[PDB]
Coordinates of C-alpha atoms in Angstrom, one line a residue:
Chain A
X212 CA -25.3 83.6 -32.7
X213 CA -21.6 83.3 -31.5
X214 CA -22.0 80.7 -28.5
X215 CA -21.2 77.7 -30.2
X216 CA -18.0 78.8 -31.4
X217 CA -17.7 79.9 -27.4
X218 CA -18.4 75.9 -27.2
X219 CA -15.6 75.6 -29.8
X220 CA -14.0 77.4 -27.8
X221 CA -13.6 75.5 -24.5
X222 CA -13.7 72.4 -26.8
X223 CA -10.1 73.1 -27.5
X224 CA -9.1 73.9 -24.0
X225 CA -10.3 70.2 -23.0
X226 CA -8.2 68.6 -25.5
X227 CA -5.4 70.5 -24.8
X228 CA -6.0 69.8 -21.4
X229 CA -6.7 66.1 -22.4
X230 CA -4.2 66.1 -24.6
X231 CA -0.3 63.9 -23.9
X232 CA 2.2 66.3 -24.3
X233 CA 5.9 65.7 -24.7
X234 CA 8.3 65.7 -22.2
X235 CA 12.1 67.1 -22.0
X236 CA 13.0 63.4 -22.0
X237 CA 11.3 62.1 -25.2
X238 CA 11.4 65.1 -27.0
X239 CA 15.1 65.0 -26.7
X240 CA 15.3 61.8 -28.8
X241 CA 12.3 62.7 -31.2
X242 CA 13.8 65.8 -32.6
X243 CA 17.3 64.2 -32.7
X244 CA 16.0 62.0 -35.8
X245 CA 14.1 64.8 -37.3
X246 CA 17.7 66.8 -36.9
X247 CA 19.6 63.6 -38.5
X248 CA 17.3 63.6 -41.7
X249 CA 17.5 67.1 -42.2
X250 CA 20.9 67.1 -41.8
X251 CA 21.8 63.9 -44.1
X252 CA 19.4 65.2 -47.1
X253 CA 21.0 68.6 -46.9
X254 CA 24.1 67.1 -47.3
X255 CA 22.9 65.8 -50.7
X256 CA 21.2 69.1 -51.6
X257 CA 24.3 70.9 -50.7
X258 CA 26.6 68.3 -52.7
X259 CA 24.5 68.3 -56.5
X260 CA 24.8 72.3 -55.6
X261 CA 28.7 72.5 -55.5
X262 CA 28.5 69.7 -58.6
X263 CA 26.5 71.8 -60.6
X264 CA 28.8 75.2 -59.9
X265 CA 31.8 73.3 -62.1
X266 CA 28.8 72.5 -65.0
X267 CA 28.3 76.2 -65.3
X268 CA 32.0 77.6 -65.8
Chain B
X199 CA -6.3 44.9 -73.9
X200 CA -4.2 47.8 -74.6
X201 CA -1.9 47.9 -71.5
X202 CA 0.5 45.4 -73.2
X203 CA 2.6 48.6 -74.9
X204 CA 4.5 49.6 -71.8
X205 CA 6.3 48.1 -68.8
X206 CA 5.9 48.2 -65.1
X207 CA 8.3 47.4 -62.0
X208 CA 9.2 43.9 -60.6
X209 CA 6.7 42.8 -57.4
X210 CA 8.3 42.4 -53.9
X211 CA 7.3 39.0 -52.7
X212 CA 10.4 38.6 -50.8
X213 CA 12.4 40.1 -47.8
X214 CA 13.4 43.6 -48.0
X215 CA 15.8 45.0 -46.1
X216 CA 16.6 48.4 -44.9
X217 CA 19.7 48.4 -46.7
X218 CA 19.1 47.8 -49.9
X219 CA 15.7 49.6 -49.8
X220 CA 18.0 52.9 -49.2
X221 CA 19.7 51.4 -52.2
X222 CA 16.0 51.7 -54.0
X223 CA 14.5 54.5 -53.0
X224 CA 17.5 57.0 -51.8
X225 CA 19.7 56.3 -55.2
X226 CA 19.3 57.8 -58.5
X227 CA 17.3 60.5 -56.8
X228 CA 19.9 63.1 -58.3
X229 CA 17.7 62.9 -61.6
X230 CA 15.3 65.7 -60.6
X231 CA 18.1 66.8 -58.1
X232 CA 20.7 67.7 -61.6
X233 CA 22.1 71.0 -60.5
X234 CA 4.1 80.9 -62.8
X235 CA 7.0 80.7 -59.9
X236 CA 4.3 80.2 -57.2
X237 CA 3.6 76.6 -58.1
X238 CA 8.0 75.9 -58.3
X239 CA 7.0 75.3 -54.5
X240 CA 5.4 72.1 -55.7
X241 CA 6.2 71.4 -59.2
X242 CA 10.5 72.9 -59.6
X243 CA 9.8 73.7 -63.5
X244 CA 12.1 76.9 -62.6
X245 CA 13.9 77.5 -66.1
X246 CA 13.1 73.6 -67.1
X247 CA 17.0 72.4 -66.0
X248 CA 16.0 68.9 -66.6
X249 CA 13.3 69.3 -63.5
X250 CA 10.0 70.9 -64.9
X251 CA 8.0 67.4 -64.5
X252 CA 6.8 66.0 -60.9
X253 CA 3.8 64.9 -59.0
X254 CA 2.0 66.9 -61.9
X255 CA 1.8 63.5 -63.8
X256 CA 2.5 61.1 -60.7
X257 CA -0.6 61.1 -59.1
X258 CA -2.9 62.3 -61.9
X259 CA -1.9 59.3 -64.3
X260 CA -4.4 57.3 -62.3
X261 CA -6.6 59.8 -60.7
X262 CA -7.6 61.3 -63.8
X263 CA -8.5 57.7 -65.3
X264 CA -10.3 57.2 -61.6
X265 CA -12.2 60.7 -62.6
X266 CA -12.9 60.1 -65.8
X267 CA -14.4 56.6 -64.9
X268 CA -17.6 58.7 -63.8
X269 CA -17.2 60.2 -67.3
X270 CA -6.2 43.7 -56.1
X271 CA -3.2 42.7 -58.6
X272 CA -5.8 42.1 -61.2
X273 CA -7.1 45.6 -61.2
X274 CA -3.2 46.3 -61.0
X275 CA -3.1 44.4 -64.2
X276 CA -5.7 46.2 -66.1
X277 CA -4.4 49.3 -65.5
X278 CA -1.0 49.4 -64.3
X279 CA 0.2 50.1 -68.4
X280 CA -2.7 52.6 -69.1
X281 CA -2.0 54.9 -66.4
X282 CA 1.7 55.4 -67.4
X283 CA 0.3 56.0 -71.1
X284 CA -2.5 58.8 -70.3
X285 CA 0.4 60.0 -67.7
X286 CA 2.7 60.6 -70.5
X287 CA -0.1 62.1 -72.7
X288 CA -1.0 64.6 -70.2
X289 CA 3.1 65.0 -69.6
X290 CA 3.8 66.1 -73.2
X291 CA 0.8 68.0 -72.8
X292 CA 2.0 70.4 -70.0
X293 CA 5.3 70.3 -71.6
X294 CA 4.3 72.3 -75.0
X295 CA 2.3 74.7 -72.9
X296 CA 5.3 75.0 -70.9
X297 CA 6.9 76.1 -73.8
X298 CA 4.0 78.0 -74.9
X299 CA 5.1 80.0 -71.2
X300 CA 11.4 74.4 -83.7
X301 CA 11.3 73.6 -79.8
X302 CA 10.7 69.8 -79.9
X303 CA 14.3 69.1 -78.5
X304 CA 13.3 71.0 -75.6
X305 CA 9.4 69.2 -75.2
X306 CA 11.4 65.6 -75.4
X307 CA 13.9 66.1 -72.8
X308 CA 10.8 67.3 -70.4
X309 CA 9.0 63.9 -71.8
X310 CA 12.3 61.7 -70.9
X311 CA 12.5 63.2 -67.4
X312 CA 9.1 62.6 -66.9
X313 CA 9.4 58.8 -68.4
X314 CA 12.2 58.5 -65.9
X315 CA 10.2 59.9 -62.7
X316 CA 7.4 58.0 -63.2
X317 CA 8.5 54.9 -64.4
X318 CA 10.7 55.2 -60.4
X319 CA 7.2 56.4 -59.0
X320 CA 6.4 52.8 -58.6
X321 CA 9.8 52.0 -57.8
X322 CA 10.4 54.1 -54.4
X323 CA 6.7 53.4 -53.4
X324 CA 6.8 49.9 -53.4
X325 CA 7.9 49.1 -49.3
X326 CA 9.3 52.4 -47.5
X327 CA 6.2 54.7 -49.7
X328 CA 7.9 57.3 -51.0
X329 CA 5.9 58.1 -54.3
X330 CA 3.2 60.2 -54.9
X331 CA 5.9 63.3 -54.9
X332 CA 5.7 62.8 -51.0
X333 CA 9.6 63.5 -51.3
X334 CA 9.7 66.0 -53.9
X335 CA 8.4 68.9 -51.8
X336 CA 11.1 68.1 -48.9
X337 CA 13.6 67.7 -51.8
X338 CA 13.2 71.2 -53.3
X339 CA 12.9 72.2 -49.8
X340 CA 16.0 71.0 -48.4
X341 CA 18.3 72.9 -50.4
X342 CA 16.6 76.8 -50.4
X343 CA 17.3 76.0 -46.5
X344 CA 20.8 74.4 -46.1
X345 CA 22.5 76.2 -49.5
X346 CA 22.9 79.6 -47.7
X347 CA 26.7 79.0 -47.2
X348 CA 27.3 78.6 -51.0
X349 CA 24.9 81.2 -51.7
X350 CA 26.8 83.8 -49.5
X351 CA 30.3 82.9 -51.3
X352 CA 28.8 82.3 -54.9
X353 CA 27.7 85.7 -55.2
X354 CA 30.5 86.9 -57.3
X355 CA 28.5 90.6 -57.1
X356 CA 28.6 92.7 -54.3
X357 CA 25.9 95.5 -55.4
X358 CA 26.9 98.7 -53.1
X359 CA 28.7 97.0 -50.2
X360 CA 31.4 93.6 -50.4
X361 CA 30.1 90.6 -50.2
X362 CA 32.1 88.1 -52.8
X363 CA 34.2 86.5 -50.0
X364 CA 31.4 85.6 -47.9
X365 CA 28.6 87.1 -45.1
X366 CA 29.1 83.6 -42.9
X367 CA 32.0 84.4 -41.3
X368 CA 33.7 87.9 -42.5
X369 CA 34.3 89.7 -39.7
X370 CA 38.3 89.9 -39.7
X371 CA 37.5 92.4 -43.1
X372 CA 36.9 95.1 -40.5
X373 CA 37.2 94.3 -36.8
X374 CA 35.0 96.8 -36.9
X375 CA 31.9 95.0 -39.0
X376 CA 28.7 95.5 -36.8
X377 CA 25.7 92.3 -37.6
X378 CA 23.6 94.8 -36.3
X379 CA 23.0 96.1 -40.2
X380 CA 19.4 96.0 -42.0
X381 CA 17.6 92.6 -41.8
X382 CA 16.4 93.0 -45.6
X383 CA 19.6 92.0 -47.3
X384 CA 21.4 88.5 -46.1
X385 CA 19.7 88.1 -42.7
X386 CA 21.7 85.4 -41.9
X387 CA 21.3 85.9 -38.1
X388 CA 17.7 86.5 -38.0
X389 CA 17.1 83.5 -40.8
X390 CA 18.8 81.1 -38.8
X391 CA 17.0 81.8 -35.6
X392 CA 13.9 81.9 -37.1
X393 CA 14.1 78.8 -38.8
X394 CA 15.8 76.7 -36.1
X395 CA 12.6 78.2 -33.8
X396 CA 10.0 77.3 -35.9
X397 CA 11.5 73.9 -36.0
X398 CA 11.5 73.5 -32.6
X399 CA 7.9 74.3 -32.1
X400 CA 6.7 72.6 -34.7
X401 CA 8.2 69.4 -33.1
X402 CA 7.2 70.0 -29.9
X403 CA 3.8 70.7 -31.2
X404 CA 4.5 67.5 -33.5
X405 CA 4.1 65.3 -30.2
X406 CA 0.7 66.5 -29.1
X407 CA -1.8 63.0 -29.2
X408 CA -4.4 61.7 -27.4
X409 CA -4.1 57.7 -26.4
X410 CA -7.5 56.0 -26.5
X411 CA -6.9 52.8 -24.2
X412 CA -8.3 49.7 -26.4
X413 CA -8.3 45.6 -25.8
X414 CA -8.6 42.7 -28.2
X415 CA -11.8 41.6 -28.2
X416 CA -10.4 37.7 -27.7
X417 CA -7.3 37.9 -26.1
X418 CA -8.8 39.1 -23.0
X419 CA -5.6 41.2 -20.5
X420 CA -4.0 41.9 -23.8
X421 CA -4.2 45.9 -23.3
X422 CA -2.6 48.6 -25.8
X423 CA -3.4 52.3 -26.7
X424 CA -4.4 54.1 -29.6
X425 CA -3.1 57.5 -30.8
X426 CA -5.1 60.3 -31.9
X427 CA -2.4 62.8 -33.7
X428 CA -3.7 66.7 -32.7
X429 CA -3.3 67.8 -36.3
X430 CA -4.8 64.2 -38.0
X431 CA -3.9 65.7 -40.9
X432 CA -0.4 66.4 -41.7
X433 CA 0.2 68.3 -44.5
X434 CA -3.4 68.3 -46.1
X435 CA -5.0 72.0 -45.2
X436 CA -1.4 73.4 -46.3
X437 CA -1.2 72.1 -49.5
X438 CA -4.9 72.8 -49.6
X439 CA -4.4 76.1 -49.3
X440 CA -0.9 76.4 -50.9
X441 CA -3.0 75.4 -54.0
X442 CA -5.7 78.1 -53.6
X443 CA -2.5 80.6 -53.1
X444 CA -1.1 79.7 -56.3
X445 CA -4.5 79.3 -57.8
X446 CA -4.9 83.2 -57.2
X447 CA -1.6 85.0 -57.7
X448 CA -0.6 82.7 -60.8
X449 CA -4.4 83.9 -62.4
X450 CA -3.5 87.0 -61.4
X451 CA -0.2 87.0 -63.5
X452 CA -2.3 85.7 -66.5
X453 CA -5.0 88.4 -66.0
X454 CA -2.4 91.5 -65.1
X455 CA -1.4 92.5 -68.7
X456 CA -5.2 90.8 -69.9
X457 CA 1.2 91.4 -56.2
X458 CA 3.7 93.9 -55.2
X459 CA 3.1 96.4 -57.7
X460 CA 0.8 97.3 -60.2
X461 CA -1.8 94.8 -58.7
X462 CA -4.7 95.3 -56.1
X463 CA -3.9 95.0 -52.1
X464 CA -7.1 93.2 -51.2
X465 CA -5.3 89.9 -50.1
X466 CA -1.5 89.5 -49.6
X467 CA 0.7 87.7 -47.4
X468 CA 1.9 90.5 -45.3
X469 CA 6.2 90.0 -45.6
X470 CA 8.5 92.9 -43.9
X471 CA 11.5 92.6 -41.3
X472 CA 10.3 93.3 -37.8
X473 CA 6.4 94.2 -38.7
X474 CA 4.9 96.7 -40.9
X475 CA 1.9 98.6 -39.7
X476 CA 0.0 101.2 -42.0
X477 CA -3.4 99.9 -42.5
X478 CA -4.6 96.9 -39.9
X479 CA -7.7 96.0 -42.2
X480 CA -4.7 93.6 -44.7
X481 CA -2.1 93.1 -42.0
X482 CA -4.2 91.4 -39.4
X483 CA -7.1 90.0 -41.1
X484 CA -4.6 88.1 -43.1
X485 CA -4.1 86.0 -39.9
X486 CA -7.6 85.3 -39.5
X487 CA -7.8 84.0 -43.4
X488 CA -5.0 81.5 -43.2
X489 CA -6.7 80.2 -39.7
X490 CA -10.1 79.8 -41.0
X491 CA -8.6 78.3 -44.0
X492 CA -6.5 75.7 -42.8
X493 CA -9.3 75.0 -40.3
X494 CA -11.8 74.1 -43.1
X495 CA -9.8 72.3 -45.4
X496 CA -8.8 69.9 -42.4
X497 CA -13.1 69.5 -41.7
X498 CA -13.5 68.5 -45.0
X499 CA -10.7 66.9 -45.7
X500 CA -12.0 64.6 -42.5
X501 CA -15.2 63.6 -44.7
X502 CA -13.3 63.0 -47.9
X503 CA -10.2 61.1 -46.7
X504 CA -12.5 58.7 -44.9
X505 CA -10.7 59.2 -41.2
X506 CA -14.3 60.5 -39.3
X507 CA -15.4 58.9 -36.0
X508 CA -17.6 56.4 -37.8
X509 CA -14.8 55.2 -40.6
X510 CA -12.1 55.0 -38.1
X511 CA -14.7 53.1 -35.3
X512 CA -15.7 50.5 -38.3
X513 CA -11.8 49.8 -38.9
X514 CA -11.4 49.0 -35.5
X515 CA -14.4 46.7 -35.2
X516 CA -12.8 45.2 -38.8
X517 CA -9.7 44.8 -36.6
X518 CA -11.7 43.1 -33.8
X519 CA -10.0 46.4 -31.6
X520 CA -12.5 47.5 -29.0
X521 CA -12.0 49.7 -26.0
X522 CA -12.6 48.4 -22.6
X523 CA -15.7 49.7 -20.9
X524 CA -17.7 51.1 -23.9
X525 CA -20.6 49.2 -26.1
X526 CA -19.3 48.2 -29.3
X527 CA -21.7 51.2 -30.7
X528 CA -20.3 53.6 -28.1
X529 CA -17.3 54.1 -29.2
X530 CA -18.1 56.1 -32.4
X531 CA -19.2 58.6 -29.4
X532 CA -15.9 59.0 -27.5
X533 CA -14.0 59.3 -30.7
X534 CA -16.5 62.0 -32.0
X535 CA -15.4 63.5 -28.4
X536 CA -12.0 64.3 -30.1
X537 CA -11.6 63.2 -33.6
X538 CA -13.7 66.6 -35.0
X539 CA -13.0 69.0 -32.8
X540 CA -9.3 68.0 -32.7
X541 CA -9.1 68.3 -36.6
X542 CA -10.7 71.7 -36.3
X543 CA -8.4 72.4 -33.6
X544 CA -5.1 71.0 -35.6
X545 CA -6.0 73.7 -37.9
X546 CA -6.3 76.3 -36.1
X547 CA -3.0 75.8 -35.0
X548 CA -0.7 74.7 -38.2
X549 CA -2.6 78.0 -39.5
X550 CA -1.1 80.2 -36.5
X551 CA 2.3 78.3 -37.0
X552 CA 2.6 79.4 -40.7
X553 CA 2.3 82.7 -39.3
X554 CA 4.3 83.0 -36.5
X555 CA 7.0 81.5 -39.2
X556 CA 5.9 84.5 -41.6
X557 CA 6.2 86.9 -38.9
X558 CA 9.7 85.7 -37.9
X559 CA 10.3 85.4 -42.1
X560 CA 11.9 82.0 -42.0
X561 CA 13.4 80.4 -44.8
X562 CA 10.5 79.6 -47.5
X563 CA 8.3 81.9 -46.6
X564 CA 7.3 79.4 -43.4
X565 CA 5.5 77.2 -45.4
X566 CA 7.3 74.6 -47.2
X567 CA 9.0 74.1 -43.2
X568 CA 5.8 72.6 -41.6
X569 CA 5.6 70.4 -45.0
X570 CA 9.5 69.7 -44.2
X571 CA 9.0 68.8 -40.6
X572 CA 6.0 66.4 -41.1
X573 CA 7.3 64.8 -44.2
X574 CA 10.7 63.8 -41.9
X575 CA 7.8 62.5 -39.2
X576 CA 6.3 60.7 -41.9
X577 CA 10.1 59.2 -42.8
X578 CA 10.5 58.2 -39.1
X579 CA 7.0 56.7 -39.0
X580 CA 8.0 54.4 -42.0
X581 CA 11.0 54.1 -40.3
X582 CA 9.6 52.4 -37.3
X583 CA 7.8 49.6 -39.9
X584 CA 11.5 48.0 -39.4
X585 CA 11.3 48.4 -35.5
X586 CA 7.8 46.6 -35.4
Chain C
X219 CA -1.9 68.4 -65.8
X220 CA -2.1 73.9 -65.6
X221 CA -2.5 75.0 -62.9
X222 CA -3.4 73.5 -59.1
X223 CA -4.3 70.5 -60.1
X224 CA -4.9 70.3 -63.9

């Protein structure tokens, strides 16, 4: 029957419960790098675009 | 021996720095970057522009030889020339069915760019690790998000309305223009928000862990922690079940003249601005498919990768890591208390943030992000190999 | 090699 997945169930609210979640302070510098790598490999994305609009006419 | 017919990249037995290993791995990756669609997600074949050849022969030039065996340095040795050769093989091999999708000139470009990507396969994985097409997906990526402000101008047509100048910034043309148009053609607005949202969960959910406190078994006051990640997995049950999406609507290309149109309705990813509701039994359901998906393919993938309870309890024991108030048997137990449940659990939720990203129709069809934001994690955790 | 993953 359906219990255990009611067992699942509460399974995941303990680990969420147990679980270190991240705070303003660290999650302020975590995402910065994330920002900084998608930003400095866009830049080379963007850049072999505009060289290859030239190639084309 | 037969291995002696090819060549193979110089060893690192000596200090390498971060600078120079940019100079490695981050040059000469315009190659593939010069200039069936539902596998261009993982293999950019497109119209073959020089890139129709990656991680297709990277990982299977050894893992079909590892298959087929059924069928150290030294062992580097043995093989390190045989791989390459059965790599190529198989590369001129899906290059003349490519072309089956007088053309030799064509095959033998394909064979060069594939001679070029793997021969650097070993060359960006030796130190930072970024081989095995690990940056391929994030590269092919990168651009279908960030190229929206050349796309906008580049479009020289303007169909019904203008658009040639640009959609960016082009309100002076009338004000007065009103953003408040349809969110089917050049969403910028909605695009933007959606992706920059689904970033910023997906990081905040990035953090989640669980720290085990463990001691050296010796050095007894020496204390440290040990992180159990919530998803465990990274990108596994994606691409997991990426592959079974493109295993089913590319078959069902093959087998049409043997998705939206002219094809059954049975199983679709549900797309529409805003939401679409007709018929609940597709729109719904579809949410409960990718969640039970992604939630299997992360159980399994526990047993096969070799991360369970048990394997993970053995490596600490082989690290002589133990926790502090447990019997060195024990602690298979309190990792069992999270390790399965959380990979169940991790998901569960990657599964409901591909949909939430569908929902809000972020760039790439929200997956393709969640690869993009773990594959930058898994930068910044090589990245930290200089901070350690 | 055609399609995910041969």
């Amino acid at each position: 029957f359906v219990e255990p997945s009611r067992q699942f169930v509460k399974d995941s609210i303990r680990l969420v419960k147990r679980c270190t979640k991240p705070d303003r302070k660290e999650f302020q510098k975590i995402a910065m790098a994330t920002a900084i790598g998608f930003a400095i490999m866009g830049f080379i994305g963007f850049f072999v675009k505009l060289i290859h609009i030239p190639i084309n006419n | 021996p037969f291995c002696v017919i090819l060549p193979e990249i110089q060893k690192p037995e000596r200090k390498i720095q971060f600078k120079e290993k940019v100079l490695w791995t981050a040059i000469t990756l315009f190659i593939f970057l010069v200039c069936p669609y539902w596998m261009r997600v993982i293999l950019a074949s497109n119209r073959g522009t020089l890139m129709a050849l990656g991680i297709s022969p990277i990982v299977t030039s050894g893992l079909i030889m590892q298959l087929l065996a059924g069928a150290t340095p030294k062992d580097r040795a043995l093989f390190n020339g045989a791989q390459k050769l059965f790599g190529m093989t198989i590369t001129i091999g899906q290059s003349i069915v490519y072309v089956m999708t007088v053309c030799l000139l064509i095959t033998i470009q394909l064979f060069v760019a594939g001679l070029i990507v793997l021969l650097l396969d070993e060359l960006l994985q030796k130190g930072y690790g970024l081989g095995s097409g690990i940056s391929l997906f994030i590269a092919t990526n990168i651009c279908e998000t960030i190229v929206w402000k050349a796309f906008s101008p580049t479009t020289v047509n303007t169909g019904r309305g203008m658009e040639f100048e640009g959609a960016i910034i082009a309100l002076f043309h009338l004000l007065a223009l009103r953003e408040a148009f349809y969110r089917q053609n050049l969403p910028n607005l909605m695009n933007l928000i959606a992706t920059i949202f689904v970033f910023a969960v997906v990081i905040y959910f990035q953090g989640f862990r669980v720290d085990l406190p463990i001691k050296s078994a010796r050095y007894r006051g020496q204390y440290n922690t040990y992180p159990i990640k919530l998803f465990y997995t990274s990108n596994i049950p994606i691409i997991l079940q990426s592959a079974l999406v493109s295993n089913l609507y590319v078959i069902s290309q093959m087998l049409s003249a043997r998705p939206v149109g002219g094809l059954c309705h049975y199983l679709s990813p549900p797309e529409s601005f805003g939401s679409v509701l007709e018929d609940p039994v597709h729109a719904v359901v579809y949410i409960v498919f990718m969640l039970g998906s992604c939630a299997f393919f992360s159980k399994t993938w526990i047993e096969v990768s070799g991360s369970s309870a048990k394997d993970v309890a053995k490596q600490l024991k082989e690290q002589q890591m133990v926790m502090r108030g447990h019997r060195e048997t024990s602690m298979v137990h309190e990792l069992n208390r999270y390790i399965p449940t959380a990979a169940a659990f991790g998901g569960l939720c990657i599964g409901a943030l591909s949909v939430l990203a569908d929902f809000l129709g972020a760039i790439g069809s929200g997956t393709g992000i969640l690869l993009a934001v773990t594959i930058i994690y898994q930068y910044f955790e090589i990245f930290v190999k200089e901070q350690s | 090699x055609x399609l995910x993953x041969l």
